[PDB]
Write an enzyme that holds these catalytic residues in place. Structure first.
Site, PDB file in Angstrom:
ATOM      1  CB  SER A 206      -1.084   0.062   0.902  1.00 40.14           C
ATOM      2  OG  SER A 206      -2.195   0.971   0.695  1.00 40.14           O
ATOM      3  CG  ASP A 577       6.793 -19.443 -31.854  1.00 37.77           C
ATOM      4  OD1 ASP A 577       7.745 -19.077 -31.405  1.00 37.77           O
ATOM      5  OD2 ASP A 577       6.687 -19.151 -32.917  1.00 37.77           O
ATOM      6  CG  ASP A 588      20.928 -33.578 -35.347  1.00 33.04           C
ATOM      7  OD1 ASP A 588      20.623 -33.957 -36.621  1.00 33.04           O
ATOM      8  OD2 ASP A 588      21.851 -33.821 -34.757  1.00 33.04           O
TER       9      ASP A 588
END
Ligand code: CA
Ligand code: CA
Ligand code: CA
Ligand code: CA
Ligand code: CA
Ligand code: CA
Ligand code: CA
Ligand code: CA
Ligand code: CA
Ligand code: ZN
Ligand code: ZN
Length: 616
Positions: A206, A577, A588
Site C-alpha cells: 500500500s 512459440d 539437427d
C-alpha cells in the site's frame, strides 16, 4: 518463478519473498484480521466499510474496536508471534542509537511535519549463535492526518490522494522526509554488525509499498548509497520507482495496485489500470467473492468504489501468495504468468468455480496456473493450457481443453470431464500419472485424482447414468466392474530400457534412466521421462511428450504429422512459440527448455510448423 529477484536463484528469491510478506503483515499488526475472519466464515454480502479504507490509508488510534472493523483481541500477540516464527525480532531504539519515539509495540514514526503518523518496523534476523545477519524495514505508510479522511466523500479523499502523489515528488521523497534520520542510524547499526546494503530487506504494503518505492528511488543518493544494493519488495503499491530495484507485487484486480504510472495520475487511475509495467507482476488474480460476482461487478471497476478494495486487503495477500510460493507449479511461472488464486469465502467456495474470468484486465496470454485452497475447491480450467492445483481438501476439477497438468493433492479428488467416456483415451505409467487425452488430442497429466466423472448421454453398458463415476485403478477405469481399459502401453523401469511399440501403436513409458524407445508403424505416444532418451518414430502420427526435468532427448524420424508436447517444462515465457527455443546444431534442430533439450535428428528448423510443436 514469478518472484525471481535480481540474481538470486528460484529458492533464495522465494525465501526473500516470504520474509517480505511476513514483515509487511507484521506492520499492520492484524488490522484486517477480524474482517478477514468474518469474510471467510460469511462471505462479502455486507461489502466493505469506508472505515476500513480510512484505516488502511491513515492508520489507527489503537488498539481495539473500530466501527465495521471486527477486532480480534489477540491481534497484537498473534502478529508478533507470526513475525518471530518467520525469524524476525523488532530492533529497539536503544539498539539503533535512535533518540526518537517508538510506541509500546516498538514501532517507529515519521520525523517531519506531514509525516509524523507514518510508521516503520525495524526488525532483525539472527543466526543460531545470536549474531545479526539481516535487517528488515517494513514500511506502514499513511496519508497524513486522520481528520482529513472524512472532510469530503471517501471517493474524493481517494481521488485527491492519488492526484497528490506525483506533483513536487511527494511519493518519491516520502521516505527521505519521513525517516531520513532513522535510516542513518540503521546504516551505523548495520555496519557495526558487519552487514552491508545487500543484507537489508525493505518491504511494505500500500502506502507502505509506495514507501518501499520511495526508498528505492532515494537509495542511490541518500544514506551514503548504503541501501543501493538492498532488496526491495513492495506489495499493492500505487506507485513504481524509476529504478530497476523494486519487485512490485500485487493482485491485478487490486484497484490500488499500479493506480499511478510511476507516480503520475492518468485517465486510467480511477478505472482499470492493467497496462504492463516492467517492475510489476501483471497477471495475478485474487479470485474472491467480489471478482466472482455479477452483482458486485455491475458498476464500472474503480478505486473510487470502496467494495473493490476487498482485493487490496493484506490477509489475502499473505494467504494467497504464500500458496503460490508453496505451489508444485512455482518454478514454471515467471513475472507475467497468469496465476488465479482461490480466495473465496467458505460459502462461495461451496458453489463457485475458480476460473480465469479475465474480468477488468487485459487479455491473459500463455498458460494459466490455478491455485486452490486447503479446503474443498471447485476449479475450472479454460480451453487453452492449464496447471490446476487442488492442494488439500476434496477437490473437483473441470477443464475445457488443451494441454494440462492437474494435481489433486491430498484428499479424494475428482476430475469431471462433462462428456462421454468414449470421447477420451486414458493411459497410466504406473508411477502415479494418469493421462487423459480428449477427442481433439489435448492431453492432461493428472496425479492424485481417484475419480473421473463422465457424462453419458446414451446408456453406458445399458447400465449407467448421465453422470458416471469411474474409479482410477492400476488396471483401468472401474465402474463397479465395468472396465474402461487403459490404452495399450509398454512400461520400462527406472533403469535404461529398450521398449518396443506394437504395430497398433503404444504409449511408451521409459521412466527414469536413459531409454531407447522404438515406435512402430502405428500411432505411438513417447514419454521418455527423466534421463536422456532416444526415441524413434518408426512411422505413423506420433506424439512426444516432455514434462519436468526431462533431460537431453533425441527424436528420430519426426515428420509433419507428428507432434512434440512440452508441458510443465522450464523456461517458457507467456506465448513463447518454438522459435524462441530452437536452434541448429549441424543437421539437427535442438529445442532448449532451461537445462533440458530435445534434438530432432536430421530435421531442418525451417521445415517445422508451430502446430506440431506445442509449448504449454
Ligand atoms: Ca494483467
Ligand atoms: Ca485447459
Ligand atoms: Ca483444495
Ligand atoms: Ca485435494
Ligand atoms: Ca527407464
Ligand atoms: Ca527415461
Ligand atoms: Ca510410430
Ligand atoms: Ca528424457
Ligand atoms: Ca510421422
Ligand atoms: Zn554468527
Ligand atoms: Zn534404435
Amino acid at each position: 518463478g514469478v518472484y525471481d529477484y535480481k540474481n538470486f536463484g528460484t529458492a533464495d528469491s522465494k525465501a526473500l519473498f516470504s520474509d517480505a510478506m511476513a514483515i509487511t503483515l507484521y506492520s499492520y499488526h492484524n488490522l484486517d484480521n477480524g474482517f478477514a475472519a468474518g469474510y471467510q466464515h460469511n462471505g462479502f454480502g455486507l461489502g466493505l466499510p469506508a472505515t476500513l479504507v480510512t484505516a488502511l490509508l491513515g492508520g489507527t488510534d489503537s488498539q481495539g474496536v473500530i466501527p465495521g472493523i471486527p477486532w480480534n483481541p489477540d491481534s497484537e500477540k498473534l502478529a508478533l508471534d507470526a513475525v518471530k516464527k518467520a525469524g524476525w525480532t523488532p530492533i529497539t531504539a536503544s539498539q539503533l542509537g535512535y533518540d526518537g519515539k517508538t510506541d509500546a509495540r516498538g514501532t517507529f514514526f515519521g520525523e517531519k511535519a506531514g509525516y509524523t503518523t507514518a510508521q516503520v518496523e525495524i526488525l532483525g534476523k539472527y543466526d543460531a549463535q545470536g549474531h545479526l545477519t539481516e535487517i528488515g524495514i517494513a514500511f506502514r505508510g499513511t496519508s497524513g492526518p486522520r481528520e482529513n479522511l472524512i472532510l469530503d466523500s471517501i471517493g474524493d479523499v481517494i481521488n485527491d490522494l492519488l492526484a497528490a502523489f506525483g506533483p513536487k515528488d511527494y511519493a518519491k521523497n516520502y521516505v527521505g522526509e519521513a525517516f531520513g534520520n532513522l535510516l542513518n542510524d540503521v546504516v551505523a547499526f548495520a555496519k557495526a554488525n558487519g552487514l552491508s546494503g545487500k543484507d537489508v530487506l525493505v518491504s511494505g504494503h500500500s502506502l507502505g509499498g509506495l514507501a518501499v518505492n520511495s526508498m528505492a528511488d532515494l537509495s542511490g543518493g541518500k544514506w551514503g548509497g548504503f541501501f543501493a544494493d538492498s532488496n526491495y519488495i513492495a506489495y499493492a503499491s500505487p506507485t513504481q520507482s524509476s529504478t530497476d530495484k523494486v519487485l512490485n507485487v500485487g493482485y491485478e484486480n487490486d484497484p490500488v495496485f499500479r493506480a499511478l504510472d510511476g507516480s503520475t495520475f492518468t485517465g486510467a487511475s480511477v478505472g482499470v489500470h492493467d497496462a504492463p509495467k516492467e517492475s510489476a507482476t501483471d497477471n495475478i488474480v485474487s479470485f474472491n467473492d467480489h471478482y466472482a460476482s455479477t452483482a458486485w461487478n455491475l458498476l464500472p471497476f474503480s478505486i473510487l468504489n470502496i467494495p473493490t478494495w476487498i482485493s487490496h486487503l493484506p490477509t489475502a495477500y499473505g494467504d494467497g501468495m504464500n500458496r503460490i510460493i508453496e505451489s508444485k507449479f512455482y518454478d514454471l511461472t515467471s513475472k507475467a504468468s497468469t496465476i488465479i488464486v482461490a480466495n473465496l469465502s467458505d460459502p462461495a467456495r461451496a458453489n463457485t468455480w475458480v476460473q480465469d474470468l479475465n474480468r477488468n484486465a487485459e487479455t491473459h496470454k500463455g498458460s494459466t496456473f490455478i491455485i486452490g485452497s486447503d479446503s474443498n475447491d471447485l476449479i475450472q480450467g479454460g480451453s487453452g493450457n492449464d496447471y490446476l492445483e487442488g492442494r488439500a481438501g476434496n477437490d473437483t476439477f473441470r477443464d475445457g481443453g488443451g494441454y494440462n497438468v492437474i494435481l489433486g493433492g491430498a484428499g479424494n479428488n475428482t476430475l469431471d470431464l462433462q462428456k462421454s467416456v468414449n470421447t477420451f483415451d486414458f493411459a497410466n505409467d504406473g508411477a502415479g500419472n494418469l493421462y487423459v487425452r480428449d477427442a481433439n488430442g489435448g492431453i492432461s497429466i493428472t496425479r492424485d485424482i481417484g475419480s473421473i466423472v463422465t457424462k453419458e448421454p446414451g446408456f453406458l453398458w445399458g447400465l449407467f447414468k448421465d453422470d458416471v463415476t469411474h474409479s482410477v485403478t492400476a488396471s483401468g477405469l472401474k465402474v463397479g466392474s465395468n472396465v474402461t481399459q487403459y490404452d495399450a502401453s509398454v512400461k520400462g523401469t527406472n533403469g535404461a530400457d529398450t521398449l518396443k511399440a506394437h504395430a497398433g501403436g503404444d504409449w511408451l513409458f521409459g521412466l527414469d534412466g536413459n531409454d531407447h524407445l522404438i515406435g512402430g508403424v502405428g500411432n505411438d505416444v513417447f514419454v521418455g521421462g527423466a534421463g536422456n532418451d532416444l526415441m524413434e518414430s518408426g512411422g505413423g502420427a506420433d506424439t512426444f511428450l516432455f514434462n519436468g526435468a526431462f533431460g537431453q532427448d533425441r527424436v528420430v524420424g519426426f515428420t509433419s504429422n507428428d507432434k512434440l508436447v512440452f508441458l510443465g517444462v522450464q523456461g517458457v515465457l507467456p506465448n513463447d512459440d518454438f522459435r524462441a527455443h530452437a536452434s541448429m546444431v549441424g543437421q539437427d534442430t535442438v529445442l532448449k527448455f532451461g537445462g533440458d533439450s530435445v534434438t530432432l535428428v536430421g530435421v531442418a528448423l525451417n521445415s517445422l510448423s508451430a502446430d506440431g510443436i506445442v509449448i504449454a
